[PDB]
Amino acid sequence: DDDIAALVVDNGSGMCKAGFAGDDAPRAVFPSIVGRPRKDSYVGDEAQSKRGILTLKYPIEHGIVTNWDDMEKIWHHTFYNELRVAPEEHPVLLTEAPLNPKANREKMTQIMFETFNTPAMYVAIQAVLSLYASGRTTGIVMDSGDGVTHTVPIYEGYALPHAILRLDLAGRDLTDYLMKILTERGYSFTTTAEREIVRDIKEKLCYVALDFEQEMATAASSSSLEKSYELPDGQVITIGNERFRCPEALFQPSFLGMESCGIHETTFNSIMKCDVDIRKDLYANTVLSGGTTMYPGIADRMQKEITALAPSTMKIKIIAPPERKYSVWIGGSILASLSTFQQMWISKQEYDESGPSIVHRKCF
């Protein structure tokens, strides 16, 4: 072969994923931390160990870059220390959350072209590249990340913003509701590390509920839903009534008091504002997402309401990938390897020849 290489870096919301294109797993994963004495600039195990006297800083936390300096700093330190390679000799494919403004994407291609100095680059939406590895290019994306959610319809090869729906229902609201339900119980959440561990327990061991009625009926008769937890630290957090109803709040938004749409509601609101000639085609590529990929149970409620959504003369096709947390990662990993992708992949020469704004058109 000997065509010029490609690498992908996805600076996520809780950890940083870095690697080479065509790698099935992430080549390196460090936590998203850039310290300051509270070393002074280090990503990795030493910064995670020093967290009592080192600040934990995530640069992207709401689907919009909140601190710009720490974003480009963790980006450069990821490429230089997390992968231990040289910036001048590698082109990088980057990803961002959807509904990033045009000025923000302009700012990023500017900073990546000048402070990092890439040979060739790509900045684009998250859910669409995640879809291209998740199965068909056309369909609808129910993407629930860790600080944003969007129901993205796509029939262009790229999203249609006329029908994109911003939804605040992400892992952020799930861990906020967890803190709320435990403070209603009267249980001290204590600290940030126990926050991350109990969020892990909600993903992994906790009951992800199958209907609101059945588990409520068994808990009202007598609870046998709890499942014992013996951590090596010695924590015992177990309660059966509480643990099916904590992720249930997506199935009834008024269970918290959420005014925004539920899952079935947001995908139905999406499909009716989309064109009806592509309707069955878009209805037969709906995706699964969320941190619940360590113990499913959301998939049955979702597929049941999607059977109930459209009539019975079309069958459901929900695409359920084996990755629903590193789906964004394997997206860029497959797309950057292709030689046909060079047409959607911009170099450094055109960025000076046709100005900065062409990154919006040719990269798409």
């Binding site: 065509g22 790698d23 099935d24 291209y132 590895a133 998740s134 199965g135 068909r136 290019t137 056309t138 090869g157 096709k317 929900i318 695409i319 359920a320 990938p321 084996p322 497959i334 390897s337 292709l338 046909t340």
Partner: protein
């Protein structure tokens, strides 16, 4: 669902009779080829349209068997419509044809020259294969054993 079964399909097409990073490359070419067509009763009739071409092309009992099975397939619907469009992608006797020595009532008739004339041809295709086999096993080995000096197996290229 199906995109996890697709991973088992990608393991099948890779030789099992390593095998962990070649899979990641074959999976890339699999996904890159898959979405091109996907981006861009009248159902048993499609099987009947090929049974007609069976009956014209000789082989009577095969088409008479095919129309016997399309009645029981209607006594999952998207599967036979895949089978009809994969019907020519496949891999490339009988003592009786003219014995009235059995039965209790057989109709009196003459010769026709399309039953017993094409019952010696059913065997003539066999005898004309079993000698063409003899020419396709001594040629495929003398092509290995005699070409010219410096031609053989690639173990000399090690």
């Amino acid at each position: 669902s199906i995109t996890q079964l697709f991973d088992d399909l990608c393991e099948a097409l890779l030789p099992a009779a390593n095998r962990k990073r070649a899979k990641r490359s074959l999976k890339k070419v699999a996904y890159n080829a898959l979405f091109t067509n996907l981006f861009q009763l009248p159902a048993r009739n499609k099987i009947l349209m090929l049974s007609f071409d069976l009956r014209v092309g000789g082989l009577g009992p095969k088409a008479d068997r095919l129309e016997e099975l399309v009645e029981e397939l209607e006594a999952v619907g998207s599967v036979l419509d895949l089978l009809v469009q994969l019907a020519g992608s496949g891999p490339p006797r009988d003592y009786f044809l003219n014995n009235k020595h059995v039965g209790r009532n057989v109709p009196y008739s003459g010769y026709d020259c399309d039953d017993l004339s094409v019952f010696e041809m059913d065997v003539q295709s066999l005898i004309s294969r079993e000698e063409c086999l003899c020419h396709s096993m001594i040629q495929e080995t003398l092509q290995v054993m005699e070409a010219a000096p410096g031609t053989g197996l690639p173990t000399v290229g090690l």
